Amino acid sequence: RRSSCFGGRMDRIGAQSGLGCNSFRY
Amino acid sequence: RRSSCFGGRMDRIGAQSGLGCNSFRY
Amino acid sequence: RRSSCFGGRMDRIGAQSGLGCNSFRY
Amino acid sequence: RRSSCFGGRMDRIGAQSGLGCNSFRY
Amino acid sequence: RSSCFGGRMDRIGAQSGLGCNSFRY
Amino acid sequence: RSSCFGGRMDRIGAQSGLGCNSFRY
Amino acid sequence: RSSCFGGRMDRIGAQSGLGCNSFRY
Amino acid sequence: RSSCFGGRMDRIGAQSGLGCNSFRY
Amino acid sequence: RSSCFGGRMDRIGAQSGLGCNSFRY
Amino acid sequence: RRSSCFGGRMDRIGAQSGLGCNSFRY
Amino acid sequence: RRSSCFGGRMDRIGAQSGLGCNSFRY
Amino acid sequence: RRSSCFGGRMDRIGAQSGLGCNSFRY
Amino acid sequence: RRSSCFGGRMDRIGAQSGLGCNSFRY
Amino acid sequence: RRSSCFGGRMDRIGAQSGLGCNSFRY
Amino acid sequence: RRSSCFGGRMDRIGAQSGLGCNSFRY
Amino acid sequence: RRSSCFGGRMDRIGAQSGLGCNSFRY
Amino acid sequence: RRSSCFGGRMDRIGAQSGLGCNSFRY
Amino acid sequence: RRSSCFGGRMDRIGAQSGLGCNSFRY
Amino acid sequence: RRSSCFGGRMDRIGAQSGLGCNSFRY
Amino acid sequence: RRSSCFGGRMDRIGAQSGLGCNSFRY
C-alpha cells in the first residue's frame, strides 16, 4: 500500500513564485 | 504499508519564493 | 508500517524564501 | 513500525529564509 | 478502527499567511 | 473501518494567503 | 469500509489566494 | 483503535504567518 | 487504544510568527 | 517500533534564517 | 484684487465625514 | 493683493471626521 | 499684501476626528 | 506684508483627535 | 471686524455622541 | 464685518448621533 | 477687531461623548 | 484688538466625556 | 491688544473625562 | 513685515489628543 491519500499539496513551484497575497517589486 | 496519508504539505519550493502575505523589493 | 500520517508540513524550501508576512528589501 | 505520524514539521529550509513575520534589509 | 483519522475534526493543514495586513498613512 | 479518514470533518488542505490586505492613504 | 475517505466532508483542497484585496486612496 | 489520531480535534498543521501587520504613519 | 493520539485535542503544530506587529510614527 | 510520533518540529534550517518576528539588517 | 475671505487656487474644502474605513470579516 | 483672511495656494481645509479606521474580525 | 489672518502657502487645517485607529480580532 | 495672525509657509494646524491607536486581540 | 474666519469646527454635539471610529455598547 | 467665512463645520448634532465609522449596539 | 481666526475647534460637546477611537461599555 | 487667533482648542466638554483612545466600562 | 494668540488649549472639560489613552472601570 | 501673532515657517500646531497608544492582548 504505497498510497499517498492526502488532502492538499503544493509541490515543485518555480523560482520567484508567489503563493498568496504576495507583493513583488523588481 | 509505505503510506503517507497526511493532511497538508508544501514541498520543493523554488528560490526567493513567497508563501503567504510576503512583501519583496529587489 | 513505514507511514507518515501527519497533519502539516513545509519541506524543501528555496533560498531567500518567505513563509508568511515577511518583508524583504534588497 | 518505522512510522513518523507527527503533527507539523518544517525541514530543509534554504539559506537566508524567513519563517514568519521576519523583516530583512540587504 | 480509524487507523490514523476519525471522529469530529476541524481545520487541518498548512495555512500560510493569515491576517497580516499593511498600512501606510 | 475508516483507515485514514472518516466521520465529520472540516476545512482540510493547504490554504495559501488568507485576509492579508494592503492599504495606502 | 471508507479506506481513506467517507462520511460528511467539507472544503478540501489547495486554495491559493483568498480575500487579500488592495487599496490605494 | 485510533492508532495515531481520533476523537475530537482542532487546528492541526504548520501555520506560517498569522497577524503580523505593518504600519507606517 | 489511541496509541499516540486520541480524545479531545486543540491547536497542535509548529506556529511560526504570531502577532508581532511593527509601528513607525 | 522505531516511531517518532511527535507534535512539532523545525529541523535542517538554512544559514542566516529567521524563525519568527526576527529583524535583520545587512 | 480684494478677495475678502477667499481667492486664488484652492482645493478640497468642507466637512468630509467618513472616508475609507472599511470592514472585513473572514 | 489684499487677501483679508484667505489667499494664495491652499490645500485640504475643513473638518474631516473619520479617516481610515477599519475593522477586522477573523 | 495684507493677509490679515491667513495667507501664503498652507496645508491641512481643521479638526480631524479619527484617523487610522483600526480594530483587529483573530 | 502684514500677516496679522497667520502667514508664510504652514503645515498641519488644528485639533486632531485619535491618530493611530489600534486594537489587537489574538 | 467681529469675524470668525476659521478652518474647521465641531460645536454643539449631542449627548452620547461619537466623533470618529468610536465603539459603543449599551 | 460680522462674517464667518470658514471651511468646514458640524454644528447642532442630535443625541446618540455618530459622526464617522462609529459602531453602536443598544 | 474682535476676530477669532483660528484653525480648529471642538466646543460644546455633550455628556458621555467620545472624540476619537474611544471604546465604551455601559 | 480683542482677538483670539489661535491654532486649536477643545472647550466646554461634557461630563464623562472621552477625548481620544479612552476606554470606559460602567 | 487683549490677544490670546496661543498654539493649543483644552479648557472646560467635564467631570470624569478622559484626555488620552485613559482606562476607566466603574 | 508685521506678523502680529504668527508668521514665518511653522509646523504642527494644535491640540492633538491620542497618538500611538496601542493595545495588545495575547
Largest sheet of chain A at a glance? none
> What is Rg of chain A?
14 Å
Distance between the termini of chain A: 47 Å
Number of helical stretches of at least 4 residues of chain A: 0
Oligomer: homo-oligomer of 20 chains
Instruction: Report the structural category of chain A.
Output: little secondary structure
What is the approximate shape of chain A? elongated
The tally of strands of chain A reads 0
| Biggest protein-protein contact in the assembly | A-B, 26 and 26 residues
The portion of residues assigned to helices of chain A is under 10%
Beta-strand fraction estimate of chain A: under 5%
Function (chains E, F, G, H, I): May have a role in cardio-renal homeostasis through regulation of natriuresis and vasodilation. In vivo promotes natriuresis and in vitro, vasodilates renal artery strips.
Site (Cleavage) (chains E, F, G, H, I): 4-5
Region (Important for degradation of atrial natriuretic peptide by IDE) (chains E, F, G, H, I): 21-25
Protein name (chains E, F, G, H, I): Auriculin-B
Describe this structure in words.
20 copies of one chain form a homo-oligomer. Chain A is mostly loops and 26 residues long. Chains A and B meet through loops of A and strand 1 of B. It is classed as protein fibril. The entry lists the keywords amyloid, cardiac amyloidosis, in vivo, aggregation, protein fibril.
Note the main attributes of this structure.
homo-oligomer of 20 chains, 26 residues, little secondary structure, Auriculin-B (chains E, F, G, H, I), protein fibril, amyloid
